[PDB]
Amino acid sequence: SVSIYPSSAEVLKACRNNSSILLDKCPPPRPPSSPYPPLPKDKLNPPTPSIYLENKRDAFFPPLHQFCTNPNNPVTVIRGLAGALKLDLGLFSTKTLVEANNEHMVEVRTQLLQPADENWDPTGTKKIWHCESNRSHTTIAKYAQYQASSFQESLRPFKTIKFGTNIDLSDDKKWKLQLHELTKLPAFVRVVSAGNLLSHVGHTILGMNTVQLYMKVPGSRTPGHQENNNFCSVNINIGPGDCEWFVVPEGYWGVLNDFCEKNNLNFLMGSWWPNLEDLYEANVPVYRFIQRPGDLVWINAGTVHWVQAIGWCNNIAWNVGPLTACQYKLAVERYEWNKLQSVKSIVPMVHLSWNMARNIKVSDPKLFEMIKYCLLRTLKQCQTLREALIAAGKEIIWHGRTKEEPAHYCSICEVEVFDLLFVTNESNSRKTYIVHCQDCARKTSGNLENFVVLEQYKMEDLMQVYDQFTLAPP
Ligand SMILES: O=C(O)CNC(=O)C(=O)O
Ligand SMILES: [Cl-]
Ligand code: NI
Ligand code: NI
Ligand code: NI
Ligand SMILES: [Zn+2]
């Protein structure tokens, strides 16, 4: 086993400046061109990779994990999952939810009921990409009343509907039985696991390493997106109705980004529902399937997808990050692309990478090299910044952090800010601690007159974590 990275002492000595240790100019991220080889028309409506579970033991069959994580499978539907594990989906019924926490908050998206797989402008004149979805907030009790009455009404120029989304099931004291039911899942889809990157973040990232619930009426749509930082997604349909999923492989996200732009929409932050006719003509394959109650949908890393309720149903969902080179690579790429687009990375990949280095014995050479490389780039960036401040006579205040303390982001550009926080004098005194990155601070004060610099980690500490992160035996 050959170490290809310099020691932390070597990195530090290099910053104190001769020959370079590495090329810090880095190729900047860009959306990929349409995959090669191109696909013919007869391969643009592929069947969905499926797993048909019958017994509890089937769910824990080891090859399951590998089938779902296989890059060639953009999505996997696991049929009969709830039944095989005898999960009580009743714990997630609207009735049970109302009884548990009837005043709990629900984000509401008001939309137009659209026909089938299509999206039309509000006048019904033509198909468009923009998906109208306006935000409000209500309680579970009040949305439950609406969901129930919507259904009763059905037993008896688009109509307006409301979609209960992003309902926060993070509090184990309000949702104890609900969250406990999910510990029955196999490790690779659990909300918390040693093999889940998001379990190593060290703090709560709502909806990713905590459970989110959806309450739906027919037509309730989640428009096109990739997960935050391209993390895999897990979704179980509670029922009683079905959901319909539309899926495009990760490699085509550049093509979809271009469609968005051509329709004057933002790919990452915009609200869009793809025109299937447009995709077909651009030779973009679409996986399309129905998720029944009890079925689990696994969305692979960076898979582009959008969803609509066909019936009345609830869903629960969260993210997982398999401990693989593929997942880490995609997460870092989106992290870098986000920076270029001034879009917030909900997963703080630097904070996480350093936690992975503290906690995880990485045995796979490719994944190990990616992480250690990240540690090298950021260790170097931190010491470079520290040396510049010291040379400019700017002092560094020890601030430290609590172990469960979240990563901080710039209040201006929303970039992750690691180890050295810039806070205005007023903000420091009032302990409001409004963080800025270096660049955004300097824009308002060239010499940082109006700012203090808080240090969260000892350099000795980072240096040790770096040196102690070594390829683990298989
Ligand atoms: O259930 C929905 O409407 C949307 N769900 C997802 O995007 C997901 O689970 O990844
Ligand atoms: Cl709003
Ligand atoms: Ni138990
Ligand atoms: Ni999703
Ligand atoms: Ni603090
Ligand atoms: Zn900034």
UniProtKB/Swiss-Prot annotation:
User: Major location, coarse class?
Assistant: nucleus
- Source domain of life is Eukaryota
Q: What is the effect of changing residue 30 to K?
A: In a patient with chronic myelomonocytic leukemia
Q: What positions does the entry give for Fe cation binding?
A: 225, 227, 305
Location of the protein in the cell: Nucleus
UniProt keyword RNA-binding present: no
Query: Is Iron-sulfur one of the keywords UniProt gives this record?
Result: no
Domain called JmjC: residue spans: 174-337
One MF annotation (Gene Ontology) recorded for this entry: histone demethylase activity
Q: What else is known?
A: Escapes X chromosome inactivation.
The protein's job, in short, is: Histone demethylase that specifically demethylates 'Lys-27' of histone H3, thereby playing a central role in histone code. Demethylates trimethylated and dimethylated but not monomethylated H3 'Lys-27'. Plays a central role in regulation of posterior development, by regulating HOX gene expression. Demethylation of 'Lys-27' of histone H3 is concomitant with methylation of 'Lys-4' of histone H3, and regulates the recruitment of the PRC1 complex and monoubiquitination of histone H2A.
User: Subunit notes for this chain?
Assistant: Interacts with TLE1. Component of the MLL2/3 complex (also named ASCOM complex), at least composed of KMT2D/MLL2 or KMT2C/MLL3, ASH2L, RBBP5, WDR5, NCOA6, DPY30, KDM6A (or KDM6B), PAXIP1/PTIP, PAGR1 and alpha- and beta-tubulin. Interacts with SUPT6H. Interacts with SMARCA4. Interacts with PROSER1.
> What is the designated name of this protein?
Lysine-specific demethylase 6A
Q: Which organism is it from?
A: Homo sapiens (Human)
Q: Provide the gene name from the record.
A: KDM6A
Q: Covered residues of the complete protein?
A: 886 to 1395 of 1401
